[model samples]
Target: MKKYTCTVCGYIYNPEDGDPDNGVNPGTDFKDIPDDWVCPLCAVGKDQFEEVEE
Candidate 1:
């Protein structure tokens, strides 16, 4: 699984530890996140996030 970073807030997300605050459970791939999911910190849309190289 890949990691994704929110471009607007520098918030990094991991599939192994999905955003609990947003009810995203672990093992959920970044691509699997709903289109409405946004950065918890910056509230930026998923479009504002980018896949990062591990």
Candidate 2:
């Protein structure tokens, strides 16, 4: 699995499927990001998400 980080807030977006109030819900897959799912933190485009390699 790949990791991701929020470019605006430096929040680490893990694949742990944690809180839903943060806009990230359980069993959330990176590939499943909806086209209309805007970043909750920065309200930036999904393109702003950068891949965090392990």
Candidate 3:
């Protein structure tokens, strides 16, 4: 699975889907992010997202 990082809050979006209230759910793909979906934590633009595979 792929990983993602929140540039503003340093929140790491992993496949585990830790906190439902804040973290992105497991199996959530980059394509799943809606065009109008804002970051729940930082509310940054989608352009700020970066892949973090490990």
lDDT, model 3, position 17: 70
TM-score for each predicted model, relative to the true structure: 0.91, 0.67, 0.62
lDDT of each: 0.91, 0.69, 0.66
Ranking the candidates on TM-score from highest down gives 1, 2, 3
How well does candidate 3 match the true structure, expressed as C-alpha RMSD?
A: 2.9
Worst 10 residues of 2 by lDDT: 10-19
- In the range 1-54, model 1's lDDT, one tens digit per residue, is 999999988999989999978878999998888889889998989998889985
Worst 10 residues of 3 by lDDT: 15-24
Angstrom error of the Cα, residue 13, model 1: value is 0.5
lDDT of 2 by residue, 10-53 (tens): 76666776337756677687667675666666777667778897
lDDT of 3 by residue, 1-54 (tens): 677787887766665673356444666675575556556678886677788965
List residue ranges in candidate 1 displaced over 4 A.
none
Candidate 1 matches the true fold with a TM-score of 0.91
Give Cα distance to truth, residue 40, candidate 1, Å: 0.6
Which candidate has the highest lDDT of all? 1
**Residue pairs whose backbone atoms clash in candidate 3:** none
